[PDB]
Amino acid sequence: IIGGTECKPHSRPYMAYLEIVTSNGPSKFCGGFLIRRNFVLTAAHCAGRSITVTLGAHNITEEEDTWQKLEVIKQFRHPKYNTSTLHHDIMLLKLKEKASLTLAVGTLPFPSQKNFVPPGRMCRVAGWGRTGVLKPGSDTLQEVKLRLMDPQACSHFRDFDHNLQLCVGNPRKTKSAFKGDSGGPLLCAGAAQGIVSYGRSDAKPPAVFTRISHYQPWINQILQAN
Numbered sequence: 001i002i003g004g005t006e007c008k009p010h011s012r013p014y015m016a017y018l019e020i021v022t023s024n025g026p027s028k029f030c031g032g033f034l035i036r037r038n039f040v041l042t043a044a045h046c047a048g049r050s051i052t053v054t055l056g057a058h059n060i061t062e063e064e065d066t067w068q069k070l071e072v073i074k075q076f077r078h079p080k081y082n083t084s085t086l087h088h089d090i091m092l093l094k095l096k097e098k099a100s101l102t103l104a105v106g107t108l109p110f111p112s113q114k115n116f117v118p119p120g121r122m123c124r125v126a127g128w129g130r131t132g133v134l135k136p137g138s139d140t141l142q143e144v145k146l147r148l149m150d151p152q153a154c155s156h157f158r159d160f161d162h163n164l165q166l167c168v169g170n171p172r173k174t175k176s177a178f179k180g181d182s183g184g185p186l187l188c189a190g191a192a193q194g195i196v197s198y199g200r201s202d203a204k205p206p207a208v209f210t211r212i213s214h215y216q217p218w219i220n221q222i223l224q225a226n
């Protein structure tokens with residue numbers, strides 16, 4: 001999270017830190033959120049051979065009682081997930097056991113929106129991602145306020161699609177989501193509306209976020225069958 005501020009410890013109880021294991025490389029990390037006691041929503045590109053979820057965290061370098069490290073038994077990537085266009089970058093992770101509901105760990109009900117969030121509206125995204133282009137990932141959960149842009153603002157991303165994704169982050173500001181924040185939720189009015197997906201390597205906003213609403217039907221499908 002570039003140009004943001006350190007969250008008030010555990011003020012975002014649904015946040016999930018993800019350590020991802022791959023075959024030919026060191027572990028990678030991503031964000032995500034707890035939508036069910038045993039289900040975490042995140043970005044499809046964050047998929048791996050195996051994944052470990054850590055809920056209730058703030059400073060990920062220091063283990064505390066609020067911590068709940070859980071085993072992921074199954075990774076559900078969207079069937080149409082495309083690595084070249086980056087469309088449908090959404091994944092559901094089913095947990096081994098259900099997490100415990102604490103002050104530091106809870107779910108973020110994938111809502112019920114009466115109307116789509118009009119650009120111009122400010123929303124917020126949190127994460128443990130890099131805080132700059134050549135900066136490392138943050139030890140503590142960062143948070144920043146970003147403006148929902150008109151789809152035109154994301155035109156340069158040749159494969160960006162309004163129906164499928166959200167354009168987030170005013171280009172006139174440096175604030176934005178960055179490497180590492182992927183999988184985290186974008187919250188507008190307290191309701192999850194997006195998932196950090198991608199942006200320019202040089203960090204110039206806007207950034208591309210998956211439009212959750214659009215996949216609500218696929219999400220309920222996976223849930224209902226597992």
Ligand SMILES: O=C(Nc1ccc2ccccc2c1)[C@H](c1csc2ccc(Cl)cc12)P(=O)(O)O
Pocket residue numbers: 044045082083084085086087089129176177178179180181182196197198199200201203207208
């Ligand atoms: O590389 C990225 N995302 C990504 C990489 C490959 C993908 C392939 C197919 C679907 C979605 C994909 C998403 C992410 C990224 C690179 S620059 C940038 C700027 C702002 C955000 Cl919020 C994320 C990213 P990450 O380094 O994993 O945080």
